[PDB]
């Protein structure tokens, strides 16, 4: 099986995919995020964050108010299933999470929580 | 004479200036906003909005809740000294306001109210 995905967030404020399917046969799933652009974190930072679709907007909004030093995420936010750190040009980061934290039937979203980025940098995740 | 400024908002969520000076010998001041770049206003819209620094955060927050169809600005907002409409790539808008609206002993800020954008898209405007 394939229990991981490789994703890029670039200088044009885009992810290079908008759809991830997590095989039910996986015990854990891994996201490897990279930044092939030239701009630094404080002006084009990207992270990869996972939540219910219903929870995305709250997570995005409290993330902005938490600020850059908190990688634009509410500390210990109950809504966040999994997250990478915030990265800039030429950096990379991975995160692994337990597939047990998901629920067949629920709708999940992945997104970047850098202010304004989720209007473009978002997509759907679902178990297969 | 010079009582105007040309401002851009681009696809990287930046204004091309973060400080605007008004000459006190102007009766009126005009801002010409443009959007170079190719993303449309529903994912990268920009406006130019002016308030006291103390009121910016309330204008921005009420703006997000007003939504896209109201240019992310609360209708009849007494806190707003001047505003453009929300524009996308290839579009333009201008706004003119009375310099008499800028008072003694107040500090003013300009910003975009599209969700998240004011984190980078903000600046100071001063009368001298
Ligand atoms: Cu981002
Ligand atoms: Cu904007």
UniProtKB/Swiss-Prot annotation, chains A, B:
CDD domains: Azurin. Keywords: Copper, Disulfide bond, Electron transport, Metal-binding, Periplasm, Signal, Transport. The keyword Cell membrane does not apply. One of its GO terms (molecular function) is zinc ion binding. PROSITE patterns: COPPER_BLUE. Disulfide bonds join 3-26. Its main location: periplasm. GO terms for cellular component: periplasmic space; plasma membrane. It comes from the Bacteria. Cu cation binds at residues 46, 112, 117, 121. Residues 1-128 form the Plastocyanin-like domain. Gene3D superfamilies: Cupredoxins - blue copper proteins. It is found in: Periplasm. Pfam families: Copper-bind (PF00127). PANTHER family: AURACYANIN-B, OUTER MEMBRANE PROTEIN H.8. Transfers electrons from cytochrome c551 to cytochrome oxidase. This is Azurin. It comes from Pseudomonas aeruginosa (strain ATCC 15692 / DSM 22644 / CIP 104116 / JCM 14847 / LMG 12228 / 1C / PRS 101 / PAO1). The lineage of its organism: Bacteria, Pseudomonadati, Pseudomonadota, Gammaproteobacteria, Pseudomonadales.
